[PDB]
């Protein structure tokens, strides 16, 4: 297949900015290549096709350039529709493929995360089950890490991460980190730690509890 | 690897310090470069970051538009370019590698400080 | 809207669905060759298949030839897929789109979970644990089937600070997620509204902060 890569992954933009996301083919397209934009929770929305020819209705601060295996979308100066998942796609030959995206989301000041632990609640400790969850609330920029730590113990395997979109009116993230144990497992142990670390943070912050205390 | 924070010193409100982050050792191109500073009796606060280049550079809220972060790859060093100071800025400066590649703020290596004061 | 898609939902493993996609009159359907472009949660786009304009020639993504049909009818402006041998991978919102128009897509679920209504824990805070003038609160909303379900904070006049988190599907089936809000810590009425829909379920959990 046609395999398709885009870059960077991410990029950070102000309203005014002018932007340039490229995408490279494995094999030579030479101009079959369509863009598309995508905002969370819609169909995505043809750019350009032809990787140059800007689609009817789509306002000209969009324009690509490029042939055979190297591609690029411009936008000459951001506005606040732009903040979406763009995709390039090669139209040259079946399977039809697609670039993994490119996120471009609002920039802003740094902002560490406040964190949050709470310990499993009684009534789900009944059931068999403990969930403990670790809240990074409001950072930016959305790089982060969370490690869990149980009587020092680093822990493996036992947690799944959720993120939230930037925020509607800060511009921030949000995330949590949950760690399920047996009930079993969970009453061996004192300490439950949730360790973060963050580009605005000096050093890494640790919120903890001792199961069994107050 | 060690760094060296230099370019402190004293200047009246609305003048300008040029400070310079240099690194001895191993090459730092790869690893993103932030500034903190300290105040007297106050904690350790982010300040700014370069991360590679073609990677942006991220501000604190309190330096916003007065100062610039910016690197210099051929001579291993950062730049914090601080125009419009103010008395509030008074710290000791220090810079910091983030050890991991992917941004997540694992500074283990950190430079002694340099003294910066504003004032009439 | 000129293409709206139907015939997803619920369905479990080695099951089969016939998706089918409605053109709007003026969307001269039949000059267009037409696909079907799915994308899973949290994941990019991946084109399923595509039917030439006079319906001459189909074209298949390999991981759903001999399992996938796509055909068409001129006359009646619509696109059908059928999908049989289904497996869970096949989640997916599911896309019926000309190259310049896209549909806002139809969710298929693959899985062999029974719907089940969600449990609702509270994630409290302490007098221990909340320090300074913020505190946080939550639910952990836990083992629910299938997506999604809505969570409002004092029946809507909570909104201000609130994250709720996008699911997880555990290994287990189930989905989870937390809701929480930070709020000043010397107000410490909190509760979370858990709606399900697909179960028709629904439970208000009281946050209550435990005092030391």
């Known amino acids: 297949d046609i395999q398709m890569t885009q870059s960077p992954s991410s990029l950070s933009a102000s309203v005014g900015d002018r932007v340039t996301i490229t995408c490279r083919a494995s094999q030579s397209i030479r101009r079959y290549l369509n863009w598309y934009h995508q905002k969370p929770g819609k169909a995505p929305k043809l750019l350009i096709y032809?990787?140059?020819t800007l689609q009817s209705g789509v306002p000209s601060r969009f324009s690509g350039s490029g042939s055979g295996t190297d591609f690029t979308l411009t936008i000459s100066s951001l506005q606040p529709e732009d903040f979406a998942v763009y995709y390039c796609?090669?139209?040259?030959?079946?399977?039809?493929?697609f670039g993994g995206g490119t996120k471009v989301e609002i920039k802003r000041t740094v902002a560490a995360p406040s964190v949050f632990i709470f310990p499993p609640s009684d009534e789900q400790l009944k059931s068999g089950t403990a969930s403990v969850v670790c809240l990074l609330n409001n950072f930016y920029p959305r790089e982060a890490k969370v490690q869990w730590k149980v009587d020092n113990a680093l822990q493996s395997g036992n947690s799944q991460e959720s993120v939230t979109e930037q925020d509607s009116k800060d511009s921030t993230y949000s995330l949590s980190s949950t760690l399920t144990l047996s009930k079993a497992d969970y009453e061996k142990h004192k300490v439950y730690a949730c360790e973060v670390t963050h580009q605005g943070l000096s050093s890494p912050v640790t919120k903890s509890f001792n199961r069994g205390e107050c | 690897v060690q760094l060296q924070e230099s370019g402190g010193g004293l200047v009246q409100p609305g003048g300008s310090l040029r400070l310079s982050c240099a690194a001895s050792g191993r090459t730092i191109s790869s690893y993103a470069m932030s500034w903190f500073r300290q105040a007297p009796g106050k904690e350790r606060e982010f300040v700014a970051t370069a991360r590679r280049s073609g990677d942006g550079a991220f501000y604190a809220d309190s330096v916003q538009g007065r100062f610039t972060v910016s690197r210099d790859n051929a001579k291993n060093t950062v730049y914090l370019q601080m125009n419009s100071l103010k008395p509030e800025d008074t710290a000791v400066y220090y810079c910091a590698i983030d050890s991991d590649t992917f941004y997540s703020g694992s500074y283990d290596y950190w430079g002694q400080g340099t003294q910066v004061t504003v004032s009439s | 809207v000129q293409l709206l898609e139907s015939g997803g939902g619920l369905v479990q493993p080695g099951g089969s669905l016939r998706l089918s996609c409605a053109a709007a009159?003026?969307?001269?359907?039949?000059?267009?060759?037409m696909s079907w472009v799915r994308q899973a949660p949290g994941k990019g786009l991946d084109w399923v298949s595509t039917?030439?304009?006079?319906?001459?020639?189909?074209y298949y993504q390999d991981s759903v030839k001999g399992r996938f049909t796509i055909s068409r009818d001129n006359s009646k402006n619509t696109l059908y897929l059928q999908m049989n041998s289904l497996r869970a991978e096949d989640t997916a919102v599911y896309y019926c789109?000309?190259?310049?128009?896209w549909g806002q897509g139809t969710t298929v679920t693959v899985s062999s979970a029974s719907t089940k209504g969600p449990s609702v824990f509270p994630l409290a805070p302490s007098s221990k644990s909340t320090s300074g003038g913020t505190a946080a609160l939550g639910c952990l909303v836990k083992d629910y089937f299938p997506e999604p379900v809505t969570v409002s904070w004092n029946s809507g006049a909570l909104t201000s600070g609130v994250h709720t988190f996008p699911a997880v599907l555990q290994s287990s089936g189930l989905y989870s997620l937390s809701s929480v809000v930070t709020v000043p810590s010397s107000s410490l009425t909190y509760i979370c509204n858990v709606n399900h829909k697909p179960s028709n379920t629904k439970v208000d959990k009281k946050v209550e902060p435990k005092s030391c």
């Open positions: 032809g990787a140059s």
């Open positions: 039917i030439s304009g006079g319906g001459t020639y189909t």
């Open positions: 796609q090669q139209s040259h030959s079946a399977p039809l493929t």
């Open positions: 789109a000309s190259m310049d128009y």
């Open positions: 009159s003026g969307f001269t359907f039949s000059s267009y060759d």
